[PDB]
Amino acid sequence: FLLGQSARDAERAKDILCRLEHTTLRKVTANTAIYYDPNPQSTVVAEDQEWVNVSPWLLRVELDRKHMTDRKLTMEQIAEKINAGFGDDLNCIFNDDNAEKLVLRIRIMNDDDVFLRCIES
Amino acid sequence: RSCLENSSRPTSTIWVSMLARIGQRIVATLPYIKQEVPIIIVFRALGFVSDRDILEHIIYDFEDPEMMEMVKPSLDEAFVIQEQNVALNFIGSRGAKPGVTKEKRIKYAKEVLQKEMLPHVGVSDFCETKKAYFLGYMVHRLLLAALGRRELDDRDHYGNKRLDLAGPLL
Amino acid sequence: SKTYQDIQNTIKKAKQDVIEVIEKAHNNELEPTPGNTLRQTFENQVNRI
Amino acid sequence: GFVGIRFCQECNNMLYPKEDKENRILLYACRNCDYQQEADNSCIYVNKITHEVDELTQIIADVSQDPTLPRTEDHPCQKCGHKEAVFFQSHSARAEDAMRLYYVCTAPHCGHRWTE
Amino acid sequence: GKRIPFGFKHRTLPHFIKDDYGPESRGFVENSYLAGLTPTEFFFHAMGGR
Amino acid sequence: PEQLMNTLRKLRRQMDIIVSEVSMIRDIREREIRIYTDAGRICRPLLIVEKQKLLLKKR
Amino acid sequence: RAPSTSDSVRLKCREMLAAALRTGDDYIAIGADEEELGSQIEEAIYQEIRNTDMKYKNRVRSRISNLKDAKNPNLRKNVLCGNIPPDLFARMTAEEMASDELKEMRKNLTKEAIREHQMAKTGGTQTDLFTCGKCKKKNCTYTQVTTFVVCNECGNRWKFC
Ligand SMILES: [Zn+2]
Ligand SMILES: [Zn+2]
């Protein structure tokens, strides 16, 4: 049972439900394409965010929209929580909230092939 | 429930199954073996040294990478065994009576793969080429069910049943 | 014999109603009634009818 | 897209993806063999989480000769222009949320299939 | 709790057609005990009463 | 597979090479023809239809 | 006027913001000082974060990327015109900086997601024939299977045989 103003409006109750329900990356994710993108700004799938931003192996991960909104999430918290999952083992070069695709790009820095696979599961 | 035709050998309830989870591995519960074995190791013991050559039996269309990337996890999971002989060792090392000498083990694992498993296809001296086809069919059909390309079988359905009348009972 | 006519009329209307639910779902216009798949909203509508 | 299995040329075995240290390129080597062949895809492993499948790729044309399968004359073909067509639902496991119908042209040597 | 299931391949009986969700095709008995039950709906009635 | 099914059923009617007790099942969706001659299969007699008329003429 | 800064990272951020504001020559037609405006946007970002860490660099990069977006030239025009003050632009979210088309698309998707997650109201025939024994209101819904009645005001349920 909800407390305050949340109790009335369907809008402000909706975010409480989001805040209880188990949302993994799997719910939001669409397509997982590991790529041997040898320079980050090469963008072997055509993207611009790296060029402005700037290991030889990448995880292009393209997200969902109508799943991303319906829970009211931005890549800011997603990338920070993936970082909180793996510490200094990884980085993410997330998209912007203007673009059409919802791409993520992961690289290692500090048996290599399967590892990207290993961490993506 | 493979059976030949009213043989002194009973029916062998083979199972070929997909594990839950690398992920996505596939195993044969062969008869009289202590435990289930990955399906690729079965076809290796059957006499297929090549990788290319095993998958032609299990995947009919090489043009859909959909089914390709599905068997990889098991195909990776057998790279240590390449010849027939080491392959036999692998099944023979898991009989109810495992043989003390290596050749005993091979002699076992050659016998189970010719008389025990899939009898209905044949129990002859060389039937591996047709035992290969039917096993690839069972894997093929599991891959179809797993891809969701085909509906699961109903155990209650009376077409999936037979009646032991006064003939078969006797 | 009037009740028979009412029943038959009701029944035909019902059979008729379900055909449009089938048309909508067959042409992808039956929108998932919140808290349901497609295949559930359908079944609900039908059973309601 | 996808990646396929690319087979060895010596042993006819499965090629693994391998990065060339000190030319900075992507290779395909063997296990059994010492066979190095040069990649082109620049793509290793792909995964459709949405599992987006088009059903018209799985539909065979042979369906049209099904006695037990409803027949219309209200949707005509597009290649030939026949009037008859059979129709069925996805008939698939893993159907996400769809009761969409699929058609096949009921005329031999055509087997054109479509969705409306 | 559901309607009559697709016991055969995408249909309830052999009399019906593949992918038939209609009232008659999934167990909706439309007769009365006075009028009697169609053969198909006899069966379905049995299925339910089981 | 359209030549086999039409041929197998003609024999299974004409009582010669395929005995009456055999069942031949054609799966359309998957490319499979299944035949059973074995024992214990429950079956029942049906009238045959051709065009949309019965083979059971008044003769 | 933005204070002068001696920090090499902050100076490079001001230069990159000014270069983003020059994208498409809109500053010439408006006659806005893009160097001063780039300095004010950087200063407002620095006042919030008070450090030159990856958080600050990510924030500056996000603003540069949104100002350079070829799909949203209106954002850069609105910043150059002073419709969006430098301090507000320095706090605005990636959702608030989006194109009007992308904002309306997100609003529609959010509204549809909310509509889909709304439970179907339980059906029945609404009637004023029944008075609720608890709240004495007449707003009731009935269904016959025996007549089952629910009061829509207090949730009280009862039946008639
Ligand atoms: Zn090789
Ligand atoms: Zn056609």
Swiss-Prot record, chain G:
Residues 9-125 form the TFIIS central domain. Zn(2+) binds at C132, C135, C151, C154. A zinc finger (TFIIS-type) spans 128-159. Keywords: Acetylation, Chromosomal rearrangement, DNA-binding, Isopeptide bond, Metal-binding, Nucleus, Phosphoprotein, Transcription, Transcription regulation, Ubl conjugation, Zinc, Zinc-finger. Necessary for efficient RNA polymerase II transcription elongation past template-encoded arresting sites. The arresting sites in DNA have the property of trapping a certain fraction of elongating RNA polymerases that pass through, resulting in locked ternary complexes. Cleavage of the nascent transcript by S-II allows the resumption of elongation from the new 3'-terminus. S-II binds to RNA-polymerase II in the absence of transcription. Belongs to the TFS-II family. It is linked to A chromosomal aberration involving TCEA1 may be a cause of salivary gland pleiomorphic adenomas (PA) [181030]. Pleiomorphic adenomas are the most common benign epithelial tumors of the salivary gland. Translocation t(3;8)(p21;q12) with PLAG1. This is Transcription elongation factor A protein 1. The gene is TCEA1. The chain holds residues 132 to 301 of 301 of the full protein.
